[PDB]
């Protein structure tokens, strides 16, 4: 006679921590900003940011991905 | 005689923590901003942000993805 | 004689925490913002934000996604 | 003239994780236990536990305690 | 003239992780236990544990304690 | 004129990790235990533990303690 016992077990842990975690920013101060523009000419897309204090966190990453394939074939 | 026992078990844990988590911003201060513009000419899209203090979190990422395939074939 | 026992088990846990979580902003302050414009010409779409303090969280991500395929074939 | 501005601020965070957290037990096994008693004499309290596999978590601790005193006195 | 501004700020973090955390126990096995007792005499309390595999976590500790005192006196 | 500005800031982090954390125990095995007792006499408290594999974590410690005193006196 024959017996097959197919019992793979996944007990893993997976963690991702991405971007800005647990930081302290203490009394941060931006300076005065002046922009003077005269007679400028633009023939294409203009993309502009003017500020004094910017805090930017950008996270395209940090996803957790599992691909698993299981397979049993008899005769 | 024959027996097959197909019992794969997933008991795992998956976590993502993405963007800005648990940060302290204490008295952050933006400065004065002046923008003066004269006689400018634009022939395509203008995209403009003017501010003093910006705090920005952008998260296209941090998704958890599981793909699992199971298969048993007898004769 | 023959027996097949097909009982794959998913007991796993999945979590996503995406964007801004548990942050403290204590007394954040934007400065004065002045924008002066004269004789400007725009020949396509203008997209503009003028402000002083902006707090922005954008989350296109952070979705949890499961694809699972099961298959049993006898003769 | 006189001004007083009494504004103490508590923004702190307090966490306890006490006992048995996030452990994995995989296929633990207790052995055979045989207890034979004859002609025994007991003249005060008997407290008995007989088993094979015991898993025990006892937490008298892990409590979070805050005591805060505020006081403002003028003349 | 006079001004008093009284603004102590608690922004701290406090964490305890006490007992058994994040451990793996893989196939732990207790052996056979035989206890034979004959003609024994007990004239006070008897406290007994008999087993094979015991897993025990006891946590009287891990409590977070904050005591804070604030005081303003004018004349 | 007079001004007082009383602003102590606590931005600290405090962490305890006490007991058994992140350990791996792989196939630990207890042996056979035989206890034979005959004609023993006990005239005060008996405290007995009989086992084969004991795993014990005891944590009276790992508590975090903050005591803070603030005080302002004018004339």
Swiss-Prot record, chains A, B, C, D, E, F:
Q: Where are the Tau/MAP repeats?
A: 2-32, 33-64
Where N6-acetyllysine occurs, the residues are 7, 13, 17, 27, 39, 43, 65
The entry's stated outcome for residue 65 to I is: In PIDB; 90% reduction in the rate of microtubule assembly
- Positions of crosslink type Glycyl lysine isopeptide (Lys-Gly) (interchain with G-Cter in ubiquitin): 7, 13, 17, 27, 39, 43, 49, 65, 71
Top-level lineage group:
Eukaryota
At which residues is Omega-N-methylarginine found?
45
- The UniProt site entry described as Not glycated is assigned to 7, 13, 17, 27, 36, 39, 66, 71
Tissue-level expression:
Expressed in neurons. Isoform PNS-tau is expressed in the peripheral nervous system while the others are expressed in the central nervous system.
Q: What is the effect of changing residue 48 to L?
A: In fatal respiratory hypoventilation; unusual apparent autosomal recessive inheritance; reduced binding to microtubules as well as increased fibrillization and aggregation
Q: Where in the cell is it found?
A: Cytoplasm, Cytosol; Cell membrane; Cytoplasm, Cytoskeleton; Cell projection, Axon
**Phosphoserine modification, residue list:** 1, 20, 48, 52
Known glycosylation sites: 43, 49, 65
Residues found modified as N6,N6-dimethyllysine: 7
Q: Which residues form the signal peptide?
A: none
Give the free-text PTM comment from the record.
Answer: Phosphorylation at serine and threonine residues in S-P or T-P motifs by proline-directed protein kinases (PDPK1, CDK1, CDK5, GSK3, MAPK) (only 2-3 sites per protein in interphase, seven-fold increase in mitosis, and in the form associated with paired helical filaments (PHF-tau)), and at serine residues in K-X-G-S motifs by MAP/microtubule affinity-regulating kinase (MARK1, MARK2, MARK3 or MARK4), causing detachment from microtubules, and their disassembly. Phosphorylation decreases with age. Polyubiquitinated. Requires functional TRAF6 and may provoke SQSTM1-dependent degradation by the proteasome. PHF-tau can be modified by three different forms of polyubiquitination. 'Lys-48'-linked polyubiquitination is the major form, 'Lys-6'-linked and 'Lys-11'-linked polyubiquitination also occur.
- What disease is linked with this protein in Swiss-Prot or TrEMBL? In Alzheimer disease, the neuronal cytoskeleton in the brain is progressively disrupted and replaced by tangles of paired helical filaments (PHF) and straight filaments, mainly composed of hyperphosphorylated forms of TAU (PHF-TAU or AD P-TAU). O-GlcNAcylation is greatly reduced in Alzheimer disease brain cerebral cortex leading to an increase in TAU/MAPT phosphorylations. Frontotemporal dementia 1: A form of dementia characterized by pathologic finding of frontotemporal lobar degeneration, presenile dementia with behavioral changes, deterioration of cognitive capacities and loss of memory. In some cases, parkinsonian symptoms are prominent. Neuropathological changes include frontotemporal atrophy often associated with atrophy of the basal ganglia, substantia nigra, amygdala. In most cases, protein tau deposits are found in glial cells and/or neurons.
What is the stated purpose of this protein? Promotes microtubule assembly and stability, and might be involved in the establishment and maintenance of neuronal polarity. The C-terminus binds axonal microtubules while the N-terminus binds neural plasma membrane components, suggesting that tau functions as a linker protein between both. Axonal polarity is predetermined by TAU/MAPT localization (in the neuronal cell) in the domain of the cell body defined by the centrosome. The short isoforms allow plasticity of the cytoskeleton whereas the longer isoforms may preferentially play a role in its stabilization.
Q: What quaternary structure, including any partners, is listed in this protein's UniProt entry?
A: Interacts with MARK1, MARK2, MARK3 and MARK4. Interacts with PSMC2 through SQSTM1. Interacts with SQSTM1 when polyubiquitinated. Interacts with FKBP4. Binds to CSNK1D. Interacts with SGK1. Interacts with PIN1. Interacts with LRRK2. Interacts with LRP1, leading to endocytosis; this interaction is reduced in the presence of LRPAP1/RAP.
Q: What is known of its domains?
A: The tau/MAP repeat binds to tubulin. Type I isoforms contain 3 repeats while type II isoforms contain 4 repeats.
This chain belongs to the protein called: Microtubule-associated protein tau
Interval of the full protein contained in this chain: 622 to 696 of 758
